[PDB]
Each structure stands twice: as structure tokens, then as C-alpha cells.
């Protein structure tokens, strides 16, 4: 009878300090969460308790505020090398600065193994990356030893820029050979640590066969086993159980994201390495767990870098500007229409009317308590990826495809659920994939006082969108084939922050933009 | 048998230069309209033609341009005088400045009689304006003499400032006896002239017993016989035929406003002073009509000293600016829309989110096409009485019985339609007076992401609107009467003025504001 505590934490997202309970800045530090300070108290308190520990990162460190935009991954190899991490696997924003990216800040200095076994390497670059990342790592733990076998979304090259000397393999077909492998080097307990959301999770957790446990990341999945201690409602229970096409009973842990809860699961084996039981729940790291003033004091040395970036106010804001995935993938959130104004309110400074955006691109709210100053920090939380906002002519028909995709699979806190500027769009849920906007009307650019009519199949309109979705991002294949002219514009960022600047006191609201019909 | 030709105008209001076809500013000379230069070439040609002429005004010169704000009546008495106006009726807008502004700048200045028999001096003025104004004036006009009978809104005292010590007593009942007067003097030939509206001048031509001819103004009325030239739609024939108590057929005049029409009937008299006949037509001063050199050459000297108020641009519009009554007084206007968002962001600068807004308190459109300029002169037309936008705060029960009366008498160019800021209204005009609104959503303030939600009658709003709302202008006695709190605001056109400036680029749109239904 050997237990095993795996503490694991996804798509942390930059947030090394502390924040609000939405992941936003840390502004009233006594309701504060998250962070890697506190991260490390738990983490202590459980190692202190428990003889077999591993700490385990499911992807998605990288990219998330301006902690990232200016150490570009030092920071996550700094601290989680400081946390002391057992094993990482690589997650789609591990790709965001290229390769390069990824091998000089962390692969080069990460004091733990990295992880995918799906990250085929080719030509040039086969040579450089050899042995930086690895399709596994034994692990000993105590008298045991424990198989970790990483795997990374077989979309990263859709999702980010790994590039085209890296090959992304289907997770199920890459992770049998190596779970076969570590079988027969006698390894009787083995753990899939890997980026590409739950539902793969699952499928790996039935499929695979000798994976007794898969520490999962990607979708953001909230589980939970009683009452829940936040906002975030749960998906299923934790831990989500599988059984395997073998008869295996499975357990799938996943843990939000942002750093605001720890996972943790305590799996009790057998002398085989059978998965007797398992039980657990992901740990809030809420202001009752004290900031470690060791890793805490070393944030603040890395932190005075980063200040230069928050003393300049842009501007103010009234409203709570919701840039939450709760309401930015699911209804009309001010967020979007701020968004959608600054850049529609840039192309003029000519005219265009029209302005959609994927509710995934807004990455974070801004709090409107802190006398509601809106900072260049604030703002790179929002939208942290160097986008530009590009002009496109598009047929109508084409704009009505991509109303459709927006709600073609609603209900699963996807990204391309569009937020709008100068289009009032009405959804019917009840109808059939394909066939749900009841009605679409668009802002004239071909008359003298602009009014909304319905949009005309037939006809040609200007809109401003993210370069992400010209190039077909978010499965927008309709726009990047479709659209008449592209042009590429200025960028995100620097045409929010114009619009703050230009406004001085913000109050977006949600006005009707998007709605649901139910009658 | 003895003809006479009367030409008339109405509601001028300051158009003393030409001005484009929906009376804004003229841009492109080769297409504008109207001014006192070309209605004297008119004047003159029909002189030439007819023996028998008088030339009449029904009131409403005062106010409307920068050229009332700055020489403050001293304008119309030249420039009328330079006409030879043969007699003038005062309007309500005569008395915007006081009866002081009255007074010096017209009455004491004109070389015209100035007339109305319904308004009666008393206290200390009455020995100040005595024989200032007079009930009627005799004319001779040829070999014969007409009696001229003015009249003045009974409902002056609430439209305009004229003060405690002037009584208005009902037209009817002030004329007639001065009708009479005549009649005993064997004056034969008897015109109402004045300014109390259409549906008053027809009362007056069915019932003060000798009036031959009624020559209206206030209700900006447009009659035609025949297909008519320009954009105004005409309310009926011209002359309106009105038969009277005692069997008589009674021509009934108006001649729309700012000085675009000449109105134009002929008379043709028996010995007895009986009305035979009449015909005629509002002239329309279009650009075929050549400017007289000699009054442009005067304008020209009088508008240097307004060139001040045109070298600053305040901003740029890239959309008609529509601040027609057509649109204004019937439906959402963008006009309406930048005014009342200007409001809301002026307030901002604590919050308040809500704005009501007369539609006849926007007294002019403004055009883009003069690459899409608007200075002090283009905002002064369209806010010219020098009001503030205050804030106010209201019982939803209040609310909901202002946009009860916004749509009480629809229909009648009737400027209390309320344009408005932070409301969505939906009206039903199929149902009974008092019972119109179906829908009327309000955007939240206890909230931190606003948002509109029903209005409740129990609840309480704060609402910015002019001060001609909050002191019950319009009829909306509810908003005088009920409110709980009113705090004075700043100057109309500073608001506007301002918020211009800080927007740089404007593009107000028509955008579901306000919508009717009809299911
Ligand atoms: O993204 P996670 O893996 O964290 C999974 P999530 O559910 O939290 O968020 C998914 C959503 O984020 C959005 N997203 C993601 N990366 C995006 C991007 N650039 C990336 C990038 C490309 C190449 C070079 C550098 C940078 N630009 C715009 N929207 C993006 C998109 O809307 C997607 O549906
Ligand atoms: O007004 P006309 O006689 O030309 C008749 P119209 O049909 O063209 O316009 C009527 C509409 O104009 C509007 N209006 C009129 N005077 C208004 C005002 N101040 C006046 C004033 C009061 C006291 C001291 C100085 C100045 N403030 C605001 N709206 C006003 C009102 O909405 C009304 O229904
Ligand atoms: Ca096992
Ligand atoms: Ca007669
Ligand atoms: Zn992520
Ligand atoms: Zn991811
Ligand atoms: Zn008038
Ligand atoms: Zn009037």
C-alpha cells in the first residue's frame, strides 16, 4: 500500500503575484489569491505531511500579464525552480515567441524535466532541441519510481507558432508506445501530464492503455467533490473518473487556471501499481494561506522592472469592465464593446461601421475599485498576444458563416464566441448548429445619418477584427478563405490604450449588441 | 374689383444669409436658399408687377442663428426695415430677451408697425410700451385702405420670457372687438395677422366675425396647390379654405419657415371689401433667384463681425448631423443622441446614466459635407436659446408618464418627443393616449456593470435634461411637479461645445433608442 499526493496547477498565466478573485490585479491584498508565494506555503505544508509528493504543471505558464511581456519566460523557469516543480509538460503558449522562445528562457534553465511525447522534431531544428524536452521522466518517489508521459494539443500549430520544424502527433497514438516502453522498464505507476483540454483527458484516460492518472490543462475545467469554496462552478466531480477501455477505473484532475487553486489528488496503490482508490480537491489559495516571505520578497525585487509599466494612469473607468470568459464567451460583456469602440473610434482618426472580436482574445476583467485607474499593466492582462486590429471587406454571406460559427457549438466556454461594434446579432439556441441567427442587422456606411438595417447576403462590408481571425484563427477557415481585401492595422494594445487616453472616463455598457431569443 | 397681393413670411428665425435646403448654414452657394437679400429680389419684382402690395411677417424673426445671439434684434429691424416690411405681428421668441430686448432693439427701431391685439400691458410697463406695438394699423394701399389685426400666442407667457406685467388674453376674444373698431371706421378690407399657429388661425378665420384673411405663423405650416417644389410636404391647399360662422370663405396662410418660401396670395376685392377670390403659392427663394447686390453687400458688412464665432472648429462630423423637426419630433434623431451623450459624458467628468430630451430644443440639422467642419455658428443654430442641462432626479412613475406625454398628440410636429440617452422606449401608437409605451428599459447605476433593465415606478432615477424640462416646458408639468431633487447645470452649448472638442471625429448613429411596434 503506497500513497501517492499529486499537487498540480494549468494555465497559470503569468499571474507570479497574487490577484483579485477574477485574476485581475491584486488591489485590496487582504481578499486576495493565487500567486506563487502562497502557491509555496501549500505546497510546503503538504510536503511537510506527506512522505510521497509531486508537483506537476499541466502547460500554459507562459503568456498572461507583463510579467511575461517583459522576462518572456525567466521568470517561469525562476520561480518554478524556486517552487521546485517534479515535472512541466508543454502547453500551445509555451509557442508564442517562437521555438527560440521556449529554449533559451525555460528548456535551457528549468531545473525539472519538460514534457511532451506528441513534439516530433525535424530538419535544422531536430539537432538543437534534442534532449531539452523529453517524451517522459521516471521519477523516483521514495522507494518508488513514478512514469511521467507529457503531451501537448495536437492544434498548437493552428493555436500559437511552434513552427514548421516541429511536428504535433496525435496524443493517443504518441503516448502508447512510450506508456509501453516505461512498462516493460518495469515502471508499474504512470501519471499523462499534458496540455489539450479535458474531453482529450478523457479519451487519453480510456484509450491509453497503463495510464493510471491524467493531470490535465487547456480548457480551464473546474472540478470539484462537494460544495464548491469560489465562483468557479464545477464541471464534474473531482476527481472525474473514467473507466478504460481495459476496466480500469481512471481518475482525470484538472485545476482551473490562474494560480488560484492547487490541485490535489492522493492516489492509494497497490504493490502492481493498481489504482486501489483515489480522493482529493483542488486547494483555493485564498488570503488565509499566508504568502511565503522568502519567494514573496524575491517577487518584489523582480516586480520594481515591471513598475514602470504601472505608474502612468492611461485613464479611469466607472464600470467593472468584465472581461471574464464566464461572460465574454457566453453574452454581450462591456469588455468586448470598449474593444470594439477603440477600434472601430482608431480607423476613423475614412469609415468602416462594423468591428467583430473573439471572446477568447479578452484575457482578463479590469477592476473599476482602485479609484478606477487603467494602467498599461491593466491592460497587457487583457490583451497580452501583439495583435493588430486589421480592415477586411467581407461578403455578407461570409460575415453571416461567421455569426454562425460563433454560436455553432455554445455552451462550452469557447473562444469564438464574438463580441461586436455597429452589428446587433439575435441567436436562437433552440435551432440547429448552422441555422441559429434569427436576426442580423449592420450598422449603413452607404448613407448620410448611419442606421441599422439587416445585413444583405449579397453585399460587401468593411469590418475591423483582430488579425487572429483574419487569418482564419478560432476555425474562422470562412474569413482568411473568403474575405475581398486585408489590411493589416495597428496594434490591439496600443489602440486601447489611445481610446482610454482620448475618453479620459470610460463606462461601457452592455447595450443590446448580442442577444437570445427564446419565445 | 380691386386685387391685392400679399407677401408674408414666418418664423424667419435669423436666417438672414441664405442657407442650405434644410436651413443650416449654406456651403454650396450654387444650391442654397432663402436670406433677406434674395426674398428682396422677389419682393421687388412683384412691386414692379402689382399695384396693390403688402408685405407681412407673422412673427418668430428673433432668435435662431449667431446673428440673434450677437446683434440681438438690432438684425431684424435693419434688415426688415431695408425690406419695407408694411407691418410685423410679435411671436413668442420676441420676447426671449425680456421685453427690454423687445423694446430697444425692434419696437423703438422699426419703421413698421409692429402689432398684437391680444397682449395688454400693466403696472409700471404698461406706460414704458405704450404705442410701441399697436392692436392693428390702417394702411393705404393704393386708393383703398387695409386694416391689419395682430394676435400673439395666448400661451407666450409659457414659451418665452415676457414677463409679469403683459397680459395674453385669447385671440378671439381680444380681436373681435377691435375687428369691430375697424368695420365702424369703414375700413372693409380686414388681415389677421399673427403668430398663435395654423389651428388657431383657422378658430380665428371661423370665428372673429369681418377678418377676410388670416396670415399665420408658430406651427411652421407649409400649404400648396399643386406639386411642390422642395422637400416640405404640404399640409394642406393653399390658400386653407375656412368657411365662417356667418357663411364667409376665408383664406387661411402660413408659409413654413427661415425665410425658404415667399408666401404669396392674391385678393381680389369687391367695392364692399368682399372677398371674391384668392390664389396663389409660397414662392420657393431657391438659387435662381439672383441675391440683390445691395442687401448682400449690407449682410456682408454685418457678417464680419459674426466671423469670430465660425475661424475656431470645434470638430468634425463624418455624418449628417439630422436636427430636422421631421426627424427629431417623430423619431430618434442622431442629433438627439449626440446631445444627449454629451450630457451623460459632461456629468461624468460621480454618475447618473439617464437623459430626456425635447425634440423642438434641436432648432437645426448640421451638414458634413464642408469636409465635415462644425464650429460655434453650426452648434449655436441648433442650441440657440442659452439654456443648461440639468440634473434631476425622478420617480420611475414620473418617467414613465413624461414618455406617456412624449407620444400623447403623435403626429403634430409637436416638439416634446423626448430624445434621449441611457433609455431604451418602445412605443405602441395603436393604443389610447396615456397607454402608448410597451417597453421602457433603463440603464442600471446599482450595479458595477451597467446594463438596461425594465423600468421600476417605485424606483428613483437621476436623469440630465434641460432646464426647459425640469421647469415643466413642453407640457411636462409631471417633471416640475414630481421630481425630488433638481441641481442647475452648465450652459447647453459648452456641453456640447465641449464634448466636440474632446471626441475630435463624431459619428452619432440611429441606433434603437427609441423603436414603435405595430404587430
Ligand atoms: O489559449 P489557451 O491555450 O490558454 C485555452 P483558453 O480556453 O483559456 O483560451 C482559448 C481562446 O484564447 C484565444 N486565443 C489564444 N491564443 C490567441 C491569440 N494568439 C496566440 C498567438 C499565436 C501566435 C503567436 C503568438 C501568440 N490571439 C487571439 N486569441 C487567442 C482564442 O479565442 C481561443 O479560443
Ligand atoms: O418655438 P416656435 O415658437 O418657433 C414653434 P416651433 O414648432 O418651431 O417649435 C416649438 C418647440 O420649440 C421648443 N422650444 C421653444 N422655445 C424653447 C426654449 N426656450 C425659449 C426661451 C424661454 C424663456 C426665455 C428665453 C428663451 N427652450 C427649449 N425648447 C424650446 C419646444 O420644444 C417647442 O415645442
Ligand atoms: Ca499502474
Ligand atoms: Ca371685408
Ligand atoms: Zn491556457
Ligand atoms: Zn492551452
Ligand atoms: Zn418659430
Ligand atoms: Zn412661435
Given at each position: 500500500?503506497?500513497?501517492?499526493?499529486?499537487?498540480?496547477t494549468?494555465?497559470?498565466?503569468?499571474?507570479?503575484?497574487?490577484?483579485?478573485?477574477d485574476?485581475?490585479k491584486?488591489?485590496?491584498?487582504?481578499?486576495?489569491?493565487?500567486?506563487?508565494?502562497?502557491?509555496?506555503?501549500?505546497?510546503?505544508?503538504?510536503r511537510?505531511?506527506?512522505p510521497?509528493?509531486?508537483?506537476?504543471?499541466?502547460?500554459?505558464?507562459?503568456?498572461?500579464?507583463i510579467?511575461?511581456?517583459?522576462?518572456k519566460g525567466?521568470?517561469?523557469?525562476?520561480?518554478?525552480?524556486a517552487?521546485?516543480?517534479?515535472?512541466?509538460?508543454?502547453?500551445?503558449?509555451?509557442?508564442?515567441?517562437?521555438?527560440?522562445?521556449?529554449?533559451?528562457?525555460?528548456?535551457?534553465?528549468?531545473?525539472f524535466?519538460?514534457?511532451?511525447?506528441?513534439?516530433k522534431?525535424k530538419?535544422?531544428?531536430?539537432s538543437?532541441?534534442?534532449?531539452?524536452?523529453?517524451?517522459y521522466?521516471?521519477?523516483?518517489?521514495?522507494?518508488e519510481?513514478?512514469?511521467?508521459?507529457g503531451?501537448?494539443s495536437?492544434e498548437?500549430?493552428?493555436?500559437?507558432n511552434?513552427?514548421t520544424?516541429?511536428?504535433?502527433?496525435?496524443?493517443?497514438?504518441?503516448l502508447?508506445?512510450?506508456?509501453?516502453?516505461?512498462?516493460?522498464?518495469?515502471?508499474?505507476?504512470?501519471?499523462?501530464?499534458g496540455?489539450?483540454?479535458?474531453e482529450?483527458d478523457?479519451?487519453?484516460?480510456?484509450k491509453?492503455?497503463?495510464?493510471?492518472?491524467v493531470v490535465?490543462?487547456?480548457?480551464?475545467?473546474?472540478?470539484?467533490?462537494?460544495?464548491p469554496?469560489?465562483?468557479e462552478?464545477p464541471?464534474?466531480?473531482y476527481?472525474?473518473?473514467?473507466?478504460?477501455?481495459?476496466?480500469?477505473k481512471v481518475?482525470?484532475?484538472?485545476?482551473?487556471?490562474?494560480?488560484?487553486?492547487?490541485?490535489?489528488?492522493?492516489?492509494?496503490?497497490?504493490?502492481?501499481?493498481?489504482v486501489?482508490?483515489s480522493?482529493?480537491?483542488?486547494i483555493?489559495?485564498?488570503?488565509?494561506?499566508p504568502?511565503?516571505?522568502?519567494?514573496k520578497?524575491?517577487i518584489?525585487k523582480?516586480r520594481?522592472k515591471?513598475?514602470?509599466?504601472?505608474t502612468?494612469?492611461?485613464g479611469?473607468t466607472?464600470?467593472?469592465?468584465?472581461?471574464?470568459?464566464?461572460?465574454?464567451?457566453?453574452?454581450?460583456?462591456?469588455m468586448?464593446?470598449?474593444?470594439?469602440?477603440?477600434?472601430?473610434?482608431?480607423?476613423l482618426?475614412?469609415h468602416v461601421?462594423?468591428?467583430?472580436?473573439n471572446?477568447?482574445g479578452?484575457?482578463?476583467?479590469?477592476?473599476?475599485?482602485?479609484?478606477?485607474?487603467?494602467?498599461?499593466?491593466?491592460?497587457?492582462a487583457?490583451?497580452?498576444?501583439?495583435?493588430?486590429?486589421?480592415?477586411?471587406q467581407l461578403?455578407?454571406?461570409?460575415?453571416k458563416?461567421?455569426?454562425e460559427?460563433?454560436?455553432?457549438?455554445?455552451?462550452?466556454?469557447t473562444?469564438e464566441?464574438?463580441?461586436?461594434?455597429?452589428?446587433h446579432v439575435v441567436?436562437?439556441?433552440?435551432?440547429?448548429?448552422?441555422?441559429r441567427?434569427?436576426?442580423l442587422?449592420?450598422?449603413?456606411?452607404?448613407?448620410?445619418?448611419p442606421?441599422?438595417?439587416?445585413?444583405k447576403m449579397?453585399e460587401?462590408?468593411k469590418?475591423?477584427?483582430?488579425?487572429?481571425?483574419?487569418?482564419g484563427?478560432?476555425?474562422?477557415?470562412?474569413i482568411?478563405d473568403?474575405?475581398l481585401?486585408?489590411?493589416?492595422?495597428?496594434?490591439?494594445?496600443?489602440?486601447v490604450?489611445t481610446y482610454?487616453?482620448?475618453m479620459?472616463?470610460?463606462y461601457?455598457?452592455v447595450?443590446?449588441?448580442?442577444?437570445?431569443?427564446?419565445?
Amino acid at each position: 500500500m503506497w500513497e501517492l499526493t499529486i499537487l498540480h496547477t494549468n494555465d497559470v498565466h503569468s499571474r507570479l503575484e497574487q490577484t483579485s478573485e477574477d485574476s485581475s490585479k491584486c488591489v485590496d491584498a487582504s481578499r486576495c489569491m493565487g500567486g506563487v508565494a502562497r502557491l509555496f506555503t501549500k505546497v510546503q505544508q503538504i510536503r511537510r505531511a506527506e512522505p510521497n509528493v509531486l508537483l506537476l504543471d499541466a502547460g500554459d505558464q507562459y503568456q498572461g500579464t507583463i510579467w511575461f511581456t517583459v522576462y518572456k519566460g525567466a521568470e517561469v523557469a525562476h520561480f518554478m525552480n524556486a517552487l521546485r516543480y517534479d515535472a512541466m509538460a508543454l502547453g500551445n503558449h509555451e509557442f508564442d515567441n517562437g521555438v527560440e522562445g521556449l529554449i533559451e528562457p525555460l528548456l535551457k534553465e528549468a531545473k525539472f524535466p519538460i514534457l511532451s511525447a506528441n513534439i516530433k522534431a525535424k530538419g535544422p531544428l531536430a539537432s538543437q532541441i534534442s534532449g531539452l524536452y523529453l517524451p517522459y521522466k521516471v521519477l523516483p518517489v521514495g522507494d518508488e519510481v513514478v512514469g511521467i508521459v507529457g503531451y501537448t494539443s495536437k492544434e498548437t500549430p493552428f493555436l500559437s507558432n511552434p513552427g514548421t520544424n516541429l511536428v504535433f502527433e496525435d496524443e493517443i497514438t504518441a503516448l502508447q508506445p512510450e506508456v509501453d516502453k516505461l512498462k516493460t522498464l518495469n515502471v508499474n505507476k504512470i501519471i499523462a501530464l499534458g496540455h489539450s483540454g479535458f474531453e482529450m483527458d478523457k479519451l487519453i484516460a480510456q484509450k491509453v492503455r497503463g495510464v493510471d492518472v491524467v493531470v490535465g490543462g487547456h480548457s480551464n475545467t473546474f472540478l470539484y467533490t462537494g460544495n464548491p469554496p469560489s465562483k468557479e462552478v464545477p464541471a464534474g466531480k473531482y476527481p472525474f473518473i473514467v473507466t478504460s477501455d481495459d476496466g480500469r477505473k481512471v481518475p482525470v484532475v484538472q485545476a482551473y487556471a490562474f494560480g488560484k487553486y492547487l490541485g490535489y489528488l492522493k492516489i492509494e496503490f497497490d504493490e502492481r501499481g493498481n489504482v486501489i482508490s483515489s480522493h482529493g480537491n483542488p486547494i483555493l489559495l485564498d488570503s488565509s494561506i499566508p504568502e511565503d516571505p522568502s519567494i514573496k520578497a524575491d517577487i518584489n525585487k523582480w516586480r520594481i522592472k515591471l513598475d514602470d509599466y504601472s505608474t502612468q494612469e492611461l485613464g479611469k473607468t466607472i464600470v467593472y469592465l468584465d472581461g471574464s470568459s464566464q461572460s465574454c464567451r457566453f453574452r454581450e460583456c462591456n469588455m468586448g464593446n470598449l474593444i470594439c469602440d477603440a477600434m472601430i473610434n482608431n480607423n476613423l482618426r475614412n469609415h468602416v461601421s462594423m468591428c467583430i472580436l473573439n471572446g477568447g482574445g479578452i484575457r482578463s476583467p479590469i477592476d473599476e475599485r482602485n479609484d478606477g485607474t487603467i494602467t498599461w499593466e491593466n491592460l497587457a492582462a487583457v490583451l497580452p498576444f501583439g495583435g493588430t486590429f486589421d480592415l477586411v471587406q467581407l461578403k455578407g454571406s461570409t460575415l453571416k458563416k461567421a455569426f454562425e460559427h460563433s454560436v455553432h457549438r455554445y455552451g462550452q466556454s469557447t473562444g469564438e464566441f464574438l463580441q461586436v461594434g455597429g452589428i446587433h446579432v439575435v441567436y436562437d439556441l433552440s435551432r440547429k448548429p448552422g441555422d441559429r441567427v434569427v436576426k442580423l442587422d449592420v450598422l449603413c456606411t452607404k448613407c448620410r445619418v448611419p442606421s441599422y438595417d439587416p445585413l444583405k447576403m449579397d453585399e460587401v462590408y468593411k469590418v475591423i477584427l483582430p488579425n487572429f481571425l483574419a487569418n482564419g484563427g478560432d476555425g474562422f477557415q470562412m474569413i482568411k478563405d473568403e474575405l475581398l481585401r486585408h489590411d493589416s492595422g495597428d496594434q490591439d494594445i496600443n489602440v486601447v490604450s489611445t481610446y482610454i487616453s482620448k475618453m479620459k472616463v470610460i463606462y461601457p455598457a452592455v447595450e443590446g449588441r448580442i442577444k437570445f431569443s427564446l419565445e
